[PDB]
Amino acid sequence: MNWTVDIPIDQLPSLPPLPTDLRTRLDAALAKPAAQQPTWPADQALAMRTVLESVPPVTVPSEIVRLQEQLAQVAKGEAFLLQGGDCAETFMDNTEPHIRGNVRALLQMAVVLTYGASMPVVKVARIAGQYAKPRSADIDALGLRSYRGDMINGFAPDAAAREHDPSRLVRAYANASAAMNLVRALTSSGLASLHLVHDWNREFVRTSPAGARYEALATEIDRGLRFMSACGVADRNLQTAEIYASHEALVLDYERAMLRLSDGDDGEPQLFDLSAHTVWIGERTRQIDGAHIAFAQVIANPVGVKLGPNMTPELAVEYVERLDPHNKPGRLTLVSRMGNHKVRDLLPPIVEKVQATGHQVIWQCDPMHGNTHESSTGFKTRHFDRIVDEVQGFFEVHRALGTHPGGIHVEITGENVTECLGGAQDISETDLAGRYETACDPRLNTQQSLELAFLVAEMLRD
Amino acid sequence: MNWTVDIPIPPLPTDLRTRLDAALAKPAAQQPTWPADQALAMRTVLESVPPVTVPSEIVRLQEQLAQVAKGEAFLLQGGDCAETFMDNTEPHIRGNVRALLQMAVVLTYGASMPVVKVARIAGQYAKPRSADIDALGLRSYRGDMINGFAPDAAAREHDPSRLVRAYANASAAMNLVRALTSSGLASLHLVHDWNREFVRTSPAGARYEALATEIDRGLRFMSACGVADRNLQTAEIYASHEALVLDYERAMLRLSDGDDGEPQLFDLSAHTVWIGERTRQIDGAHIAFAQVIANPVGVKLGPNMTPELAVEYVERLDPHNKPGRLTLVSRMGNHKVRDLLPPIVEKVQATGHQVIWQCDPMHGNTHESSTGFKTRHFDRIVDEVQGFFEVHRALGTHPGGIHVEITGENVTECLGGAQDISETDLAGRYETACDPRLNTQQSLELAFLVAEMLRD
Amino acid sequence: MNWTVDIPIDQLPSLPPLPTDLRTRLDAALAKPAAQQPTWPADQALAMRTVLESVPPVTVPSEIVRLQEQLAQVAKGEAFLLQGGDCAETFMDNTEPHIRGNVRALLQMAVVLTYGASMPVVKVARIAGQYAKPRSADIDALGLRSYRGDMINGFAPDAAAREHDPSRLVRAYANASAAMNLVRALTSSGLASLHLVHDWNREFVRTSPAGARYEALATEIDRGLRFMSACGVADRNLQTAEIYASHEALVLDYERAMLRLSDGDDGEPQLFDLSAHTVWIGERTRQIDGAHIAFAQVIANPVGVKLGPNMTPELAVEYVERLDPHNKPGRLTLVSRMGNHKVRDLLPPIVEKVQATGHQVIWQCDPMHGNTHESSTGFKTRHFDRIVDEVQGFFEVHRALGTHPGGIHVEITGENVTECLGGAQDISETDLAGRYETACDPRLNTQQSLELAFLVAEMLRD
Amino acid sequence: MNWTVDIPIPPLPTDLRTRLDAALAKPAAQQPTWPADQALAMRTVLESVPPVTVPSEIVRLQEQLAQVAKGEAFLLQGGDCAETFMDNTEPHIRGNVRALLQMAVVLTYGASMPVVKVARIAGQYAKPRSADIDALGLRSYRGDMINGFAPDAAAREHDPSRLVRAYANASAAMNLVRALTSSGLASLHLVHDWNREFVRTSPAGARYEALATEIDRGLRFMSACGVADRNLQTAEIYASHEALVLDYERAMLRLSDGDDGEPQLFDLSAHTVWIGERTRQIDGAHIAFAQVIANPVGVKLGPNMTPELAVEYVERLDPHNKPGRLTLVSRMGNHKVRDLLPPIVEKVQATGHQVIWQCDPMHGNTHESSTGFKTRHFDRIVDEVQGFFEVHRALGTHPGGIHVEITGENVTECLGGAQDISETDLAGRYETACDPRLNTQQSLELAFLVAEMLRD
Ligand SMILES: N[C@H](Cc1ccc(O)cc1)C(=O)O
Ligand SMILES: N[C@H](Cc1ccc(O)cc1)C(=O)O
Ligand SMILES: N[C@H](Cc1ccc(O)cc1)C(=O)O
Ligand SMILES: N[C@H](Cc1ccc(O)cc1)C(=O)O
Ligand SMILES: [Mn+2]
Ligand SMILES: [Mn+2]
Ligand SMILES: [Mn+2]
Ligand SMILES: [Mn+2]
DSSP, X not given: OOSEEEEEOOOOOOOOOOOHHHHHHHHHHHXXXXXXXXXXXXXXXXXXXXXXXXXXXXSOHHHHXXXXXXXXXXXXXXXXXXXXXXXXXXXXXXXXXXXXXXXXXXXXXXXXXHHHHTSOEEEEEEOSSOOOOOOSOSBOTTSSBOOOOTTTSOSSSSHHHHSOOTTHHHHHHHHHHHHHHHHHHHHTSXXXXXXXXXXHHHHHHHHSTTHHHXXXXXXXXXXXXXXXXXXXXXXXXXXXXXXXXXXXXOOHHHHHHTEEEOOSSSSSOOEEETTOSEEEEOTTSOOTTSHHHHHHHHOOSOEEEEEOTTOOHHHHHHHHHHHOTTOOTTSEEEEEOOOTTTHHHHHHHHHHHHHTTTOOOEEEEOOSTTSOEEOTTSOEEOBHHHHHHHHHHHHHHHHHHTOOOOEEEEEBOSXXXXXSBBTTTXXXXXXXXXXXXXXXXXXXXXXXXXXXXXXXXXXXXX | OEEEEEOOOOOOOHHHHHHHHHHHHSOOSSOOOOOHHHHHHHHHHHTTSOOSSOHHHHHHHHHHHHHHHXXXXXXXXXXXXXOOSTTOSHXXXXXXXXXXXXXXXXXXXXXXXXXXXXXXXXXXXXXXXXXXXXXXXXXXXXXXXXSOSSSSTXXXXXXXXXXXXXXXXXXXXXXXXXXXXXXGGGOHHHHHHHHHHXXXXXXXXXXXXXXXXXHHHHHHHHXXXXXXXXXXXXXXXXXXXXXOOHXXXXXXXXXXXXXXXXXXXXXXXXXXXXXXTTSOOTTSHHHHHHHHBOSOEEEEEOTTOOHHHHHHHHHHHOTTOOTTSEEEEEOOOTTTHHHHHHHHHHHHHTTTOOOEEEEOOSTTSOEEOTTSOEEOBHHHHHHXXXXXXXXXXXXXXXXXXXXXEBOSSOOOOSXXXXXXXXXXXXXXXXXXXXXXXXXXXXXXXXXXXXXXXXXX | OOSEEEEEOOOOOOOOOOOHHHHHHHHHHHTSOOXXXXXXXXXXXXXXXXXXXXXXXXXXXXXXXXXXXXXXXXXTTSOEXXXXXXXXXXXXXXXXXXXXXXXXXXXXXXXXXXXXXXXXXXXXXXXXXXXOOOOSOSBOTTSSBOOOOTTTSOSSSSHHHHSOOTTHHHHHHHHHHHHXXXXXXXXXXXXXXXXXXXXXXXXXXXXXXXXXXXXXXXXHHHHXXXXXXXXXXXXXXXXXXXXXXXXXXXXXXXXXXXXXXXXXXXXXXXXXXXXXXXXXXXXXXXXXXXXXHHHHHHOOSOEEEEEOXXXXXXXXXXXXXXXXXXXXXXXXXXXXXXXXXXXXXXXXXXXXXXXXXXXXXXXXXXXXXXXXXXXXXXXXXXXXXXXXXXXXXXXXXXXXXXXXXXXXXXXXXXXXXOOSBBTTTTBOTTGGGXXXXXXXXXXXXXXXXXXXXXXXXXXXXX | OEEEEXXXXXXXXXXXXXXXXXXXXXXXXXXXXXOHHHHHHHHHHHTTSOOSSOHXXXXXXXXXXXXXXXXXXXXXXXXXXXXXXXXXXXXXXXXXXXXXXXXXXXXXXXXXXXXXXXXXXXSOOOOOOSOSBOTTSSBOOOOTTTSOSSSSTGGGSOOTTHHHHHHHHHHHHHHHHHHHHHSGGGOHHHHHHHHHHHHHTSTTHHHHXXXXXXHHHHHHHHHHTTOOSSSSSOOOEEEEEEOXXXXXXXXXXXXXOTTSSSOOEEETTOSEEEXXXXXXXXXSHHHHHHHHBOSOEEEEEOTTOOHHHHHHHHHHHOTTOOTTSEEEEEOOOTTTHHHHHHHHHHHHHTTTOOOEEEXXXXXXXXXXXXXXXXXXXXXXXXXXXHHHHHHHHHHTOOOOEEEEEBOSSOOOOSBBTTTTBOTTGGGTSOOOSSSOOXXXXXXXXXXXHHHHHHHO
């Protein structure tokens, strides 16, 4: 009588274990200390991991190999990386309309960035697994154990909901696989048709308060599309697009259980994390001798590491030597998150020192996480202008060094939320209370996220 | 050992609500017996989940099925008799997708036209039973969406939680099917290399070597003409199951957007579904439900079928005369198909409608071995397809497709084939949770044999 | 000892004649009076016609059927027609560099017009047969029989060269077939690669005195091309383009001898003029009951008729009823040539009356032939501004009526000649003496012709 | 009855002028004997005409021939023995293009790799003669570029005007070949329908029916896989002839632009040319001329060829080791090819160069019938190709192509084939101006036979 349904779990499948040699390596890596982990019983975690070891994967190795090839092109300055989605996915909002809205928002941004960059845009959603977060404080403002994301505990402000529940590992997988199934369906459908997506962009221009500002570029894009059609271009590639899946690799119980061995028809068999295509390590879990970095070493997926204002050029180089030991362009993405007031100063010496190693990382801008403040109305928020300005500074840093501004990583949604201040809608502190729906950080709403794409497209054209 | 889901706390057009309600108020056979309050809670959860399929895919399938109905493509439908939660694994799903693709390339070459590939996967978790009590005195197993296979009373109790578990398993499997078909798994060259290995290491491989080599030379010719890899890297595999548990199917209904004609109810648990022999009551809820949804649908037709009732199905389920909207799945027994099928085909053809005529050569050819196993002889399966082709050839109508039960596993479930599986062999790997499936070699051998029927 | 080589002629092939019924129709049509015909002996003309009846055709029926399909799209407002080349081709200048230059100039114009129009451009060269012209006066300023074009007599100002020589019919065919062979080779080569052609346009923008003016659009075109490549567009259609062949059908001895019966695998067999893909009838030979119009009725090719300032709406309708009797969109092109000072007034009532017939002609602008004057330095010339202004007025006429401004027909060359006044080079009366090379009317040089395309592209965008 | 052309009234790089001059100062066999002043005037005209081919096409052909040399494509070269001005007509040109395309589809399927199509057209107007005086006591006919076929003295005088007439005819023919190959003439489906008609109405059609049906099923399979019309509508047919008359070839030289490496002399009278058995003197002008031009070139090799001299041709004509730059055309007689060819192939292969090994099964198998006609037996032609394949099969080398004399006409020139053309039949339609050609049926029958050699 709690209005919840229990779904029984079975670990019946008989599947061979991972090879002894790879397990031996994995065990040695996971013996390292791991920050920010859930505190549930080991016996229960083991049982859940055992279930997840036998489930169909979310992604397959050939997709990850294909992504790696596309990311190598980004690292070489021949493509641009767009990564975006919810700050925190919730099980409650993991619905068709919400997923479709986020996929749509990403695609809308991508066509604008493609035109502005004059090169392919690799589209990576924060989706199908972004269910876990780190917490700075053990006790939140309400005197409760902190919400850690839906893979660990519940958002609701009650004690029972905040207890760490290892059954969530399986609920997370169910939600991730369901979302990924839909993302695949949507991208191979008309939704990712280039003409349809740009029609939405055209509507945005009509009805945005600053639409006059973006009308020139929008018209130019439309004339570019029309030109393709006029040139008799095969329409086949226009109809569908590839959207990859990503999340912060935080809960090692989940990530380790989703490891699979590739079939070895591409090269040599090895460990892939098939919970996603690519994952990144967060600022609070990137300890150089910690388990997260060690885990990222062992897997074959492309990986990223968040770099905040305390980053040194020397530590950045250590990440490069640990995580890109074979010098594979695009294998490693370094995600700069410095604050708009600091990026121009702190980023250049890191870029210089890393470039001198001879490795080719992707330099990606996260203009969100270094630009967060609390409004006077109590809401955790970010100003659009500061977000835009960090990307601007990021481009200036790279332009001065002759290096590639390789992409952005943003928190966005297709919803008309009121979470970030500013944009052409001029969202105010007062407005924030209307639709502040994020379970964690403030997201750019659908209009703000498209406006950012127009602005970044202009930076690319400069 | 429970994961737990929260029960969530825009209305249909009035006419669709009225029609759905009317369909569901009709009597429904073979339904689980679980409490209505619990079923409702499970349905409420399922009404909020991401769909297994989307309407544009179903519209696309309908277009491809119209081509089949017009005699311009061929329908291959196949997979497990019963999917189980236990066996819903990567190797098993990959094996079945592979088996289907292997058959498809052979049938494509033999038919000289496209083959529409529809898998009995991502939802085939419910079955009817003639008897509530089985041979062991237990309440019958009705598939994993309803109760458990294990032969004990507690496991056989009907459990509405399985509705959600079924969705979880379906969506996981569908995700993988999509991934596998966009991969190199569905590259033509790769798939036909597997067929070449089969020819080397089959006891009757000499028999199929000529056609296998001809296919290989056909593929090479494509490459030689400079037309390779344009469309060969990928394929579309659609999802199907018997629409049996109305609690599940109704909860997976979604209303389409106004982009295509008018808004319509689609069953997004699958691309296409069929109504079985025990649930096709003409005034029953299953047929009424099939009338309300926009998916392509099929109806199983067994040996008691009359030409007149077949026409009544056509007029109820294809009221607007949409080629391929309706598939009539003949399942008559190899000894009866030649006698019973022609007067049904004639009467239906005279209506001016264009159904897909599909052969189910499995369900009319089942017997029990002396070793206790429920089995089917390969020869009888082949012979029903043969007779089905003869019927259509004599009438000038289109033998439109097959519907088979198969797996990529090396099971020992059906007698015969080039491996010459015997009654004794059956005990080695009889793994089906319901009917005997053609194993990977038998299913490929059938494709070679059907390809020769197509060439004749 | 005249520095000429005689090439012997043989009429040896044994080929079946045209069907008796079609010949009966053709004879009845050619019994009509024909203006502007050469005055060579009938016996000699017959012998030359007999030779030409057996030679390989310049074009084939399937190409003409394909052109007709593309012209139907123009007539329906879904494509734009670009027709251009020398005023008069000469045998002496029928060389690889000159042909390549003209093909290049046309392609350069086409990519700009394609982008501006946002729809396909049908490319029809005045080439591989434009060897005959009408003369108003029997005696020219030098007291000689007038030059009639190289199919009839020689440009050189001497009596012997000006005598009408029926062997020219065969020399014309030799030159036409040679030129057509090269046009085919050039268009299926890298020359008609879209990227290569637009690079030339980019160079033009750098070095034109008014390049600043066209830089915006040129950059936009470049970004449009880059976008195609970024979208992963199949490059196959970009590599090659179709350039069709056209000329004024003037010398009926030539045109009748180049008639062939199609093989009848498309529809019914009928008469095609295989000296070209499409031909037009000139202002001085378009007598409604004359042989040229009657000849155009009998052939299946798409045809055009020049319409000058004396045209009435009623006569225009008669052309439509004679030449498009089966109401086939694009079969008939009406080519308006009214003078820039008259087009806005004279064109509308013609368009209205023709549109009311229910037929769909292509409305094409010839902004050259109504805008010709004689400079004070003696040269026959045209001002660029007047040429541009007639096209401008032509667009205004159609915009007001809701009808389709369907194309242009211009005289151009890839040479850096000094024939038309004005353009960004500001060609003056004095400049004309430097490189006035036309054997008849003044052509837009390569820079002027590309500048016109930019200007017309802007008209299309308005 | 003369058309008259005006004699027209940027220099080569110094090294190319020096090398061209040196090549042309060497002795040249089999040249016409006409006055130098008149030849010069004709050359001056030809130096100003539009070229028959362009350098980018020749570069593209070189790339495709490299693939042949590497064992990844097959070369089909064919057409009239001697083109005539009289027969340079639309029906005749279309017929020959059609015959070549028909052969090509069959060879493509049999080889399981692309076929490079090179026609002996648009320039094959000159031939050598062993004797200046022929059997009638007249100065020999040397082809229409030199003198006339008619058996009278005045017509046999060497006339430099024919140089221009040859160009006029070549450029006209090339224009049509281009038009025809971009049309539906070169649609695969259309061309193979003609092959199906041939099978119906050949006296030995039963023999080729299996392969013809297999090809048809291969084409249908392409269409079924959704890959039809992407590349099937058109094909590339290149132009070739024996480079014999140096006045013509030198006048048709053009210097390429700097876009590709460095500027080079291309002979733009054709895409590729070969040097004949009577003009391949190792220190002669023809070989020297072939060294200076950038086109792919070939050399005919008859039964007096040594392995050592073959190597000397390879080292002179392929000095930079460019696969496919050089084609060695074996022409040994069917009774000799097995004996003479292997030691040549071995010695050449040991050099590390990759030539194309091409079989000319015509010119070593010619005899005079008792009815006076110069003829060849079909069986001997087939047997030389057979032996050529056996030679390469034993050595592990690539049987790279054939070079045949054919026409789309139903002539009676070669004995045998399924029509069983006899000595008596030869008088009906013996139309060749030089050697006996395979007629349209014989040429297609050869393709079927060679396709089976390729499949073995
Ligand atoms: N074999 C599945 C495991 C599974 C699949 C999908 C899922 O969302 C959860 C769990 C079961 O036993 O139920
Ligand atoms: N909204 C999802 C519902 C869900 C998704 C996936 C699934 O397999 C079952 C149930 C949740 O709360 O968990
Ligand atoms: N058969 C050609 C006719 C011909 C072809 C080409 C040409 O340019 C002129 C004349 C001849 O007798 O010469
Ligand atoms: N410039 C050409 C030369 C020419 C072209 C074509 C041809 O067949 C022969 C000669 C002329 O004066 O006629
Ligand atoms: Mn965040
Ligand atoms: Mn079954
Ligand atoms: Mn003019
Ligand atoms: Mn010969």
